[PDB]
Amino acid sequence: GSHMASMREFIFKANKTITSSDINLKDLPGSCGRLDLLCRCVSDAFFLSHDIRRDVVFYAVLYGQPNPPVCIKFVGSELKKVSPDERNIAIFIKKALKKFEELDEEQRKDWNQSTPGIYVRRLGFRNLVLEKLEEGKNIYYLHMNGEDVENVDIENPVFIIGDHIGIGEEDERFLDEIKAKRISLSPLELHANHCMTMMHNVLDKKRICEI
Amino acid sequence: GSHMASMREFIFKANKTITSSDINLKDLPGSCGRLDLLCRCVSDAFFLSHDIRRDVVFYAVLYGQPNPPVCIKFVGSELKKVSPDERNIAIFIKKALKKFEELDEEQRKDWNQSTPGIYVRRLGFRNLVLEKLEEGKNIYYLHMNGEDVENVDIENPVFIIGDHIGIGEEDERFLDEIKAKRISLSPLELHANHCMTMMHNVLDKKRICEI
Ligand SMILES: [Mg+2]
Ligand SMILES: [Mg+2]
Ligand SMILES: [Mg+2]
Numbered sequence: 001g002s003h004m005a006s007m008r009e010f011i012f013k014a015n016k017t018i019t020s021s022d023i024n025l026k027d028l029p030g031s032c033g034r035l036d037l038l039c040r041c042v043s044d045a046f047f048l049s050h051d052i053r054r055d056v057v058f059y060a061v062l063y064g065q066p067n068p069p070v071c072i073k074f075v076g077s078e079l080k081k082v083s084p085d086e087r088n089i090a091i092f093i094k095k096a097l098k099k100f101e102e103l104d105e106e107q108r109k110d111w112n113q114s115t116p117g118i119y120v121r122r123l124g125f126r127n128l129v130l131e132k133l134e135e136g137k138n139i140y141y142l143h144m145n146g147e148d149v150e151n152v153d154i155e156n157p158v159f160i161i162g163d164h165i166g167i168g169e170e171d172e173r174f175l176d177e178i179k180a181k182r183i184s185l186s187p188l189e190l191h192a193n194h195c196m197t198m199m200h201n202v203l204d205k206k207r208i209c210e211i
Numbered sequence: 212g213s214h215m216a217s218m219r220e221f222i223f224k225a226n227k228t229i230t231s232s233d234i235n236l237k238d239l240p241g242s243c244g245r246l247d248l249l250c251r252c253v254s255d256a257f258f259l260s261h262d263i264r265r266d267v268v269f270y271a272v273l274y275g276q277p278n279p280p281v282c283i284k285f286v287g288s289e290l291k292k293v294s295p296d297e298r299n300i301a302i303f304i305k306k307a308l309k310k311f312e313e314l315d316e317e318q319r320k321d322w323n324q325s326t327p328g329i330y331v332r333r334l335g336f337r338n339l340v341l342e343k344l345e346e347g348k349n350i351y352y353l354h355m356n357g358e359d360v361e362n363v364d365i366e367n368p369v370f371i372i373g374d375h376i377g378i379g380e381e382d383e384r385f386l387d388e389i390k391a392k393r394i395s396l397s398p399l400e401l402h403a404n405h406c407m408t409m410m411h412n413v414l415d416k417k418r419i420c421e422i
């Protein structure tokens with residue numbers, strides 16, 4: 001074995017997801033701007049059968065009205081009292097957005113914990129990716145026309161996952177500029193949350209041959 | 212290519228999921244008996260990015276109080292007005308259970324449509340599996356100690372997926388008896404809904420090399 005372990009980190013850009021705590025739990029998809037999708041991504045990033053993945057960090061950058069961008073960071077090793085269902089996760093996200101509302105613009109420059117393992121910050125998608133590059137991460141863009149993941153060595157990863165409409169031409173230009181490596185998990189276009197499930201499975205299996 | 216296509220069919224045994232329409236949407240996991248899990252399984256069985264999988268049939272057999280068993284059958288090619296979020300699916304399941312409540316015991320011997328593509332019937336797990344065997348299906352049991360799916364030819368499949376506690380010693384005996392083939396998708400124990408995602412991905416990829 002190589003005995004190499006690394007954090008699995010994901011960034012999901014939520015193009016339209018609501019950025020105030022004024023959340024209608026009864027319309028997560030419509031009035032909340034596909035908040036349901038974001039909740040499933042959180043669920044799929046962390047939850048196993050009788051456990052939570054302690055090596056995962058998940059970042060969501062929300063661009064919906066009225067206060068974008070808001071970045072919410074979930075740290076698997078620290079999360080308490082989150083369960084895999086959308087309603088529970090949505091309430092945790094509501095709490096995070098409420099915390100963000102209580103902070104001034106200076107305070108929002110930093111990560112601010114709302115509940116254990118959940119932090120909010122004024123941070124956009126590109127600045128977040130830059131910050132990860134400076135830490136030494138490799139950026140991988142999960143995109144259906146990328147290299148077959150089967151053949152790529154993955155090291156110190158940050159996985160980028162777009163939503164229903166996607167990252168957009170602007171941010172693709174940017175990923176191209178910083179040399180993000182595109183990887184494919186499937187011949188079909190999947191929901192963002194399915195990508196994370198596939199990506200975890202790829203890494204779980206490599207762990208068996210290689211580490 | 213072989214030009215071979217087949218229906219992808221799944222059976223999920225929901226050990227504790229509620230069997231009346233008296234459903235608390237605000238406690239899908241607790242008072243509904245892990246109804247949230249069943250909803251995610253439905254979601255993951257059917258939904259792609261800009262589509263629904265028309266070659267899938269999903270069966271759920273619910274064993275929770277007060278009227279078990281209830282079998283709900285979802286037919287991908289027929290579903291209308293279902294979206295991927297748990298709340299929407301839970302309401303469709305509520306409707307199905309309401310339909311079941313309105314039928315007498317004789318009427319429950321047959322499939323009874325509640326909403327397009329959704330049918331309810333008094334049918335237990337074993338009788339359902341028997342019925343599928345008699346139709347010519349091969350039964351595959353997704354179980355973490357099974358053969359690596361990579362190496363198994365899959366033909367005319369019905370995939371069995373247990374829940375959080377699992378199929379149970381009784382029904383395992385039965386699957387052993389009828390010679391169900393056990394297949395593994397992962398070195399880790401996953402949520403039932405993740406199995407379906409992995410299983411779809413395996414089939415989508417084979418479709419590319421072989422069909
Ligand atoms: Mg690792
Ligand atoms: Mg950071
Ligand atoms: Mg097929």
Ligand SMILES: [Mg+2]
Nearest residue numbers: 284322342343
């Ligand atoms: Mg039938």
